Design a protein around this ligand. Structure first.
Ligand SMILES: *[C@@H]1O[C@H](CO)[C@@H](O[C@@H]2O[C@H](CO)[C@@H](O[C@@H]3O[C@H](CO[C@H]4O[C@H](CO[C@H]5O[C@H](CO)[C@@H](O)[C@H](O)[C@@H]5O[C@H]5O[C@H](CO)[C@@H](O)[C@H](O)[C@@H]5O)[C@@H](O)[C@H](O[C@H]5O[C@H](CO)[C@@H](O)[C@H](O)[C@@H]5O)[C@@H]4O)[C@@H](O)[C@H](O[C@H]4O[C@H](CO)[C@@H](O)[C@H](O)[C@@H]4O[C@H]4O[C@H](CO)[C@@H](O)[C@H](O)[C@@H]4O[C@H]4O[C@H](CO)[C@@H](O)[C@H](O)[C@@H]4O)[C@@H]3O)[C@H](O)[C@H]2NC(C)=O)[C@H](O)[C@H]1NC(C)=O
Ligand SMILES: *[C@@H]1O[C@H](CO)[C@@H](O[C@@H]2O[C@H](CO)[C@@H](O[C@@H]3O[C@H](CO[C@H]4O[C@H](CO[C@H]5O[C@H](CO)[C@@H](O)[C@H](O)[C@@H]5O[C@H]5O[C@H](CO)[C@@H](O)[C@H](O)[C@@H]5O)[C@@H](O)[C@H](O[C@H]5O[C@H](CO)[C@@H](O)[C@H](O)[C@@H]5O)[C@@H]4O)[C@@H](O)[C@H](O[C@H]4O[C@H](CO)[C@@H](O)[C@H](O)[C@@H]4O[C@H]4O[C@H](CO)[C@@H](O)[C@H](O)[C@@H]4O[C@H]4O[C@H](CO)[C@@H](O)[C@H](O)[C@@H]4O)[C@@H]3O)[C@H](O)[C@H]2NC(C)=O)[C@H](O)[C@H]1NC(C)=O
Ligand SMILES: *[C@@H]1O[C@H](CO)[C@@H](O[C@@H]2O[C@H](CO)[C@@H](O[C@@H]3O[C@H](CO[C@H]4O[C@H](CO)[C@@H](O)[C@H](O[C@H]5O[C@H](CO)[C@@H](O)[C@H](O)[C@@H]5O)[C@@H]4O)[C@@H](O)[C@H](O[C@H]4O[C@H](CO)[C@@H](O)[C@H](O)[C@@H]4O)[C@@H]3O)[C@H](O)[C@H]2NC(C)=O)[C@H](O)[C@H]1NC(C)=O
Ligand SMILES: *[C@@H]1O[C@H](CO)[C@@H](O[C@@H]2O[C@H](CO)[C@@H](O[C@@H]3O[C@H](CO[C@H]4O[C@H](CO)[C@@H](O)[C@H](O[C@H]5O[C@H](CO)[C@@H](O)[C@H](O)[C@@H]5O)[C@@H]4O)[C@@H](O)[C@H](O[C@H]4O[C@H](CO)[C@@H](O)[C@H](O)[C@@H]4O)[C@@H]3O)[C@H](O)[C@H]2NC(C)=O)[C@H](O)[C@H]1NC(C)=O
Ligand SMILES: *[C@@H]1O[C@H](CO)[C@@H](O[C@@H]2O[C@H](CO)[C@@H](O)[C@H](O)[C@H]2NC(C)=O)[C@H](O)[C@H]1NC(C)=O
Ligand SMILES: *[C@@H]1O[C@H](CO)[C@@H](O[C@@H]2O[C@H](CO)[C@@H](O)[C@H](O)[C@H]2NC(C)=O)[C@H](O)[C@H]1NC(C)=O
Ligand code: NAG
Ligand code: NAG
Ligand code: NAG
Ligand code: NAG
Ligand code: NAG
Ligand code: NAG
Ligand code: NAG
Ligand code: NAG
Ligand code: NAG
Ligand code: NAG
Ligand code: NAG
Ligand code: FRU
Ligand code: FRU
Ligand code: NPO
Ligand code: NPO
Ligand code: NPO
Lengths: 624, 624
């Protein structure tokens, strides 16, 4: 095939394996060296302060299978180094009857077996596995392994009675799933349960949730408690923590709860970050983050959600997490968010961005699939002095409201997300930074106005503050990865409250997805203000477009323009007039970002392989 | 429990694990250090002249499961040393999706991958597996591994296309089984196929059989040929080598062909041992040895058989092995015979002797199950100058006859088996040998006459030649493991041609088997003789009783007397009179035999373990 990016693309399906390896590939973020990746796993801050990140991995293939933990480490979330051992960059792989079908997601007990960091993970064996299939007990169990070398290798507990797997009995019949154990400490839950520990005999300092659901009756998050402090074999089932209905939706701001949960976690946050109080901090909020499946017509039937919850203690010594309000962690092509504690009272979240090639047309030509999102600090976002005339404000859909004593202003609380400052500092410092003059978008505004400085490649960031009239019908935003013939348009339309990514012209290559992305964004109007403001930040990284609005709304998507010069960026304006003006300020472009994998050459493909005719016989993995 | 062997046994089911480890345990033969063992596998003579023996092994359990290769070596078939590596005495174990359900039987390519000894073995995965179940393609495949350290460890080929497993497609639909690859070189088969290699393109110097059958339509031995010399991935299916009918029997001397073959092998022998001619040696005979299942009402539904065959070349470049005559390799509690070449033009065979505790009542108390037989030289047994008035002679059931030119005498040919001379020499040399005076059994003979010298423990051998009148109705034999209250009786009754082992009084412990064993023995009468002779040799080794008659008939069984003094032996006589006399000569007792595992302590138990509740969930292994 021809790789001439100055002319229209040919038939790229004729290209060899990994011939398009560098063409669309992110450079400034976490990604496997090659092949298939999906969910983050095994995330923890090591004793030396560095971050260990695992991920679901299938090297030398471009579909899921033999799923293993690949791993790497970083001192700043931003520049990474691969582990290299006897299995390359893998550190846990299928090896025993109980996990031979896949080492699924798992999470870290920092002070575990013999004092070592310990992973509790879903060990899978044979049989139908899935929320739409007739799964049986044993197919998904939960197992332990520990590391004596800070994540370079893991030792599994032995197979058998009183050893691995450590959790195998289904807590209810007819489960849709039983996976993704999330281990956490919780002074809050310990305080709530302290008066009931005689009922259950579970007194350990670690809790674990397991994600699943019940056939025909919606998703479930099951809560376990470590039976005894310092002992890791026995985990006592308390009860369902979160119970939702079959394809239940809390509404337009909240996705859909589907039929089954995946990768659920539990945290507690306050306005500064992570909160480790027992309930005494009145500014702190309990949150659950979770994926749902089969409640969405597109995006691989997957919603990455979160909910604020109020805990109630049941008479049998378990906890009901009652949903107070419910939102979306990312509105685009991402899923499988994991969060973990970081020193300085932080909780950091990261997810997986899948490709937009669902028919698997150019995956072999790429030689890889998937990347992470950026790493995000979670916190309680608080907006003070909100005007009660903010449209829709008292729906309290994915936020809560608290009136002032006099009823004239409102305090809004919701989940905040922002890129970790280490990454922003490194990006800015390594980039060519252009601080741009403010622009009034009025009757003279073109549909597209290129920035006065332009990117030089597909690795850049941009930010801007868009000030709108309170009754505007104008739209504005950013165009990125743009030439005359290919471009991706990011619009906000305050009248509809919709942030969209229009991808009809994103690429000349017709096999990639081109559906319009959509997020809801609430501009909380401030008392006394005669305008409302959207702070919009965009990261462009190969084919990833990752959008953040108001440290609250995130939308990750993909664009694969063919032409070498489809790298431009600028401002979008629609329906701006002399009377309906959009003021854009705080404009800045960072060109270049950071080389996130400095030790890797440009092409880390090792080729692709086929599992052969037995893949279809076993029926577990696609085989390629 | 009480282990007082001077009084009646108590309730031994109350005894702890491995508390009866030494009580009944063989000392003079090949046996695992502890736990479950079954079939011999991976047998070969190493470059240094020593013998490598593998076996199906499940350490720390007393039922089958996670089946692996345990291994040991010997310079004389008799004194053995265990391998000791990272997995103890195991050297191959389930580790990959293709073999995670068990590393089943396999055999050796001496000059294989990169010139190293290479095993071709049955790699098993998930799904129904068995001749009475609905097995599917993929559940049993055939895979390669090689050793760079003379059997201390094995490296498997990688999983995938053009790698492991190397044989996976079923040659016919609806197989009852597809396992136990037997690799061999054959100048005979090469010569037969040389004119047809254009039809199949298979020209390699190794052949392999795979054992199985077809549902409802009997057993099958499938023949493959290595496609190209020096290359080990591609094996071409030629056709069925042996085809038998559903529960077909050739008769009383020949067991039953059942529904499915296991552990089948192919060899060529002459009167001296192994024959490596191309067909030019007129004294050589082609043989197949094979196990059959579900054609027997007892003995675990298993027959260990052999057949002499005449090869025919089919038009499609395959071989039909037409059965000429058909016999039994061992008439007792043994199965899974494997044979292998040994320097000096020898073919040596060894099998597995199972316990007689089929309800698994005292297996945990033993802490082990199973042993090998002794190692046996195979050869063509030729008897000259046989009288045509030998009863039943021209049935030619498990032998062939060739008349002299004048029709007055017959040459008889059959399969010969004898204990390897290395073992007999070592046994005799380490024993207290008593050469006993000949005994005429007549009207004065007691039912039981103790030998003039007695054994001192349960480890001894005895031999004798019993001369009978041509029209005798007398019976005689040996009693072993004998006190007043417990004993095992080995009888030959020339009038019925039956060799029996009567075990009604073998033990005071009622849970062990007590059924009478039976073999057919043909005393070929010699021209001019006025008598007929049975040469009977018996090895007593813990609980094993292994009987050989006339270097032809073998019968392995088990006896578990409780009393410490149930060790005696002597002569049996029934219906001997002044006129019907049995002359016994060549009588000799070897007391002690050899310590076959000199580096092992008396108790090599490591305890027993339970796999836990997941064993029943996975449904593959009993779990204990
Ligand atoms: C079917 O059969 C399968 C095969 O048998 C079976 O799988 C095997 O299961 C067994 C049993 O569970 C596993 O055995 C365990 O192994 C653990 C260590 O595992 C790691 O290391 C081994 C060995 O590594 C050596 O060899 C390899 C290979 O050559 C080398 O690469 C290594 O470098 C290393 O080499 C050195 O050592 C060799 C000899 O050992 C030398 O020959 C060599 O020269 C070198 O010097 C690896 O093989 C393992 O790899 C495999 O597993 C990993 C995942 O873990 C995979 O990723 C990988 O691909 C492989 O598959 C692995 O790296 C042991 O720790 C463990 O022993 C502990 O537990 C048992 C009980 O379960 C105790 O009896 C024992 O005492 C140990 O417990 C003590 O120690 C720990 C801390 O160390 C404590 O937590 C514990 O409390 C206890 O303490 C006690 O003692 C203390 C005294 O110090 C005292 O203070 C305490 O108070 C207390 O009393 C166990 O041996 C085996 O690994 C499996 N093998 C494989 C290949 O899978 C499978 O399950 C079966 N399936 C079924 C269904 O039945
Ligand atoms: C799901 O994922 C699973 C995990 O990824 C996956 O299983 C893995 O599959 C891969 C791919 O098939 C296997 O990789 C192969 O490994 C073979 C060696 O295997 C043995 O050794 C390894 C490594 O041993 C080191 O590490 C262990 C663990 O720490 C130590 O115990 C050892 O002591 C040793 O340690 C040293 O080295 C380390 C680094 O390597 C150092 O860190 C350390 O300090 C030490 O110095 C073991 O791990 C293996 O154990 C496992 O497997 C055994 C059974 O085999 C089990 O019993 C055991 O329990 C474990 O499970 C094992 O002992 C390699 O030989 C092989 O590489 C060859 O093939 C590939 C292609 O397939 C070629 O690319 C490569 O070039 C090699 O081929 C050349 O060499 C051979 C001869 O050596 C030739 O025959 C061949 O023609 C070719 O020659 C070429 O080069 C020549 C130049 O010299 C030239 O002359 C020729 O012309 C030609 O060009 C391959 O790497 C891996 O072992 C599996 N791992 C496990 C744990 O199972 C699984 O399949 C997946 N499942 C699915 C469904 O997808
Ligand atoms: C001697 O060797 C055995 C191995 O053979 C060692 O382990 C024991 O194995 C036997 C099987 O041989 C197991 O028996 C089965 O037990 C289950 C129920 O077990 C539960 O209750 C037990 C009694 O208090 C308890 O000990 C068990 O605890 C272990 O297992 C749990 C996991 O469940 C684990 O968390 C613990 O830490 C322990 O490891 C467990 O709670 C029973 O259902 C089985 O019944 C079947 O079989 C019987 C007998 O034929 C039959 O009557 C039933 O109808 C049914 O068909 C079976 O009894 C035993 O549990 C194992 N014990 C263990 C692991 O401690 C044993 O330890 C060795 N002894 C010594 C001293 O070393
Ligand atoms: C590029 O990367 C791929 C891995 O993705 C490398 O391997 C090839 O993978 C593809 C799948 O991506 C395989 O395609 C399938 O092939 C089978 C039929 O294969 C047979 O015929 C082939 C053509 O001549 C031949 O090459 C194969 O030989 C290999 O495998 C045998 C074992 O069977 C082995 O013994 C050999 O040594 C070889 O290793 C084999 O004989 C086909 O049935 C599949 O069809 C399905 O999918 C297609 C596509 O969607 C669809 O149209 C069908 O309807 C059906 O659903 C599929 O085409 C391919 O066989 C693999 N090739 C190999 C292993 O050589 C590939 O090698 C990499 N290229 C390079 C240059 O590195
Ligand atoms: C948009 O971003 C601006 C700039 O960061 C935010 O304004 C700042 O608000 C903080 C208080 O939290 C002040 O300390 C700064 O001085 C403000 N800077 C200004 C006004 O330039 C603004 O709050 C953001 N708006 C939204 C809606 O998120
Ligand atoms: C029983 O054993 C005896 C002793 O080994 C066998 O008799 C020997 O036969 C060989 C010929 O093959 C002679 O060289 C020996 O001298 C014979 N010894 C004798 C008669 O004492 C005898 O053939 C065996 N009989 C059977 C039926 O197997
Ligand atoms: C970019 O490339 C295309 C195709 O080579 C060309 O037509 C166009 O003029 C170039 N420059 C742009 C769009 O600014
Ligand atoms: C505790 O009660 C809740 C609510 O009825 C129930 O769902 C849960 O299963 C119970 N926990 C147990 C039985 O451990
Ligand atoms: C909150 O304030 C709004 C606006 O003043 C008012 O309509 C509403 O009733 C108030 N809610 C409460 C609980 O006082
Ligand atoms: C550039 O990036 C590296 C890697 O993250 C970072 O450590 C470094 O501080 C950055 N350089 C700057 C900020 O000048
Ligand atoms: C309208 O927009 C253009 C471009 O920003 C600017 O030059 C002009 O001053 C604006 N008009 C007013 C009245 O500010
Ligand atoms: C052997 O032991 C039993 C039981 O202790 C005893 O009755 C008998 O007399 C002993 N001696 C024999 C049978 O020669
Ligand atoms: C032997 O003990 C077992 C328990 O292992 C008991 O069930 C059985 O009834 C006992 N047999 C007796 C007393 O005969
Ligand atoms: C060769 O012919 C025999 C007899 O018909 C048949 O059983 C066998 O399958 C054939 N071999 C092939 C098709 O490879
Ligand atoms: C073989 O010899 C027996 C006895 O003399 C005779 O009955 C039979 O017919 C002979 N067979 C042949 C083929 O000559
Ligand atoms: C005793 O047994 C050993 C082990 O087989 C053997 O090598 C040795 O030669 C024997 N001793 C003799 C025959 O005196
Ligand atoms: C009968 O048998 C006994 C014991 O062997 C012996 O003493 C006696 O001589 C035998 N009788 C004859 C006639 O040989
Ligand atoms: O790769 C398997 C893993 O990916 C997920 O399905 C999320 O997409 C998890 O539930 C599971 O552990
Ligand atoms: O342990 C499994 C092995 O044992 C046998 O069933 C014979 O009894 C073989 O066919 C198989 O390879
Ligand atoms: O791209 N940019 O100029 C940016 C991006 C992010 C940010 O927080 C500030 C500026
Ligand atoms: O499939 N199985 O459970 C088996 C197969 C063969 C055997 O010898 C024992 C058990
Ligand atoms: O026990 N014995 O005296 C024997 C056993 C076997 C043998 O070949 C000769 C004598």
């Amino acid at each position: 095939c021809s790789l001439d990016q100055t002319v229209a693309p040919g038939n790229l399906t004729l290209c060899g394996n990994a011939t398009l390896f560098t063409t669309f590939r992110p450079k400034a973020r976490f990604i496997a060296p090659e092949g298939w990746m999906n969910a983050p796993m095994g995330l923890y801050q090591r004793a030396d302060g560095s971050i260990h990140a695992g991920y679901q991995s299938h090297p030398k293939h471009i579909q899921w299978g033999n799923i293993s933990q690949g791993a790497a480490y970083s001192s700043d979330f931003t520049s990474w180094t691969d582990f290299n051992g006897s299995e390359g960059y893998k550190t846990i792989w299928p090896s025993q009857i109980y996990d031979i079908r896949g080492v699924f997601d798992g999470s870290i007990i920092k002070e575990g077996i013999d004092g070592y960091p310990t992973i509790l993970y879903t060990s899978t064996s044979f049989g139908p596995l899935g929320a739409t299939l007739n799964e049986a007990e044993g197919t998904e169990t939960q197992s332990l392994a520990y590391t004596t070398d800070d994540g370079a290798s893991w030792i599994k507990l032995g197979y058998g009675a009183g050893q691995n797997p450590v959790i195998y009995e289904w807590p209810e019949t007819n489960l849709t799933g039983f996976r993704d154990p999330y281990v956490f400490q919780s002074p809050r839950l310990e305080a709530l349960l302290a008066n009931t520990t005689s009922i259950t005999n579970a007194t350990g300092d670690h809790f674990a949730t397991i994600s699943g659901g019940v056939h025909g009756d919606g998703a479930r998050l099951f809560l376990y408690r470590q039976h005894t402090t310092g002992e890791f074999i026995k985990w006592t089932y308390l009860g369902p923590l979160v119970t939702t209905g079959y394809k239940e939706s809390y509404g337009e701001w909240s996705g859909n709860y589907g039929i089954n949960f995946e990768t659920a976690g539990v945290t507690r946050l306050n306005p500064a970050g992570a909160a480790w109080d027992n309930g005494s901090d009145t500014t702190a909020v309990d949150f659950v983050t979770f994926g749902t499946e089969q409640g969405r017509a597109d995006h691989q039937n997957h919603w990455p959600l979160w909910a604020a919850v109020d805990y109630e203690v049941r008479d049998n010594g378990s906890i009901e997490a009652v949903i107070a309000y419910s939102g979306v962690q990312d509105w685009g092509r991402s899923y499988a968010y994991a969060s973990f504690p970081v020193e300085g009272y932080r909780q950091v979240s990261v997810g997986w961005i899948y490709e937009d090639d669902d028919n698997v047309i150019l995956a072999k030509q790429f030689g890889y699939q998937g990347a992470f999102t950026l790493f995000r600090d979670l916190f309680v976002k608080v907006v003070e002095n909100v005007s009660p005339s903010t449209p829709g404000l008292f729906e309290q859909a994915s936020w809560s409201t608290k009136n002032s004593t006099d009823g004239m202003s409102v305090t809004v609380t919701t989940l905040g997300q922002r890129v970790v400052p280490e990454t922003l500092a490194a990006y800015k410092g390594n980039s060519t930074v252009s601080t741009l003059a403010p622009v009034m978008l009025n009757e003279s505004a073109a549909a597209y106005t290129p920035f006065s400085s332009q990117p030089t490649d597909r690795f850049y960031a941009l930010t801007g503050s868009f000030e709108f009239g309170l009754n505007t019908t104008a739209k504005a935003g950013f165009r990125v990865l743009a030439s005359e013939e290919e471009y991706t348009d990011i619009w906000f339309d305050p009248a509809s409250e919709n942030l969209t990514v229009v991808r009809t012209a994103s690429s000349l290559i017709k096999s990639f997805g081109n559906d319009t992305e959509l997020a809801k964004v609430k501009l909380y109007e401030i008392v006394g203000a005669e305008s409302k403001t959207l702070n919009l930040t965009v990261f462009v990284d190969g084919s990833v477009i990752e959008i953040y609005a108001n440290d609250e709304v995130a939308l990750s998507t993909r664009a694969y323009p063919w032409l070498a010069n489809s790298t431009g960026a600028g401002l979008l304006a629609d329906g701006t007039t002399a009377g309906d003006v959009v003021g854009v300020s705080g404009l800045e472009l960072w060109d270049g970002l950071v080389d996130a994998w400095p030790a890797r050459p440009a092409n880390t493909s090792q080729g692709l392989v086929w599992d052969g005719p037995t893949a279809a016989m076993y029926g577990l993995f696609a085989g390629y």
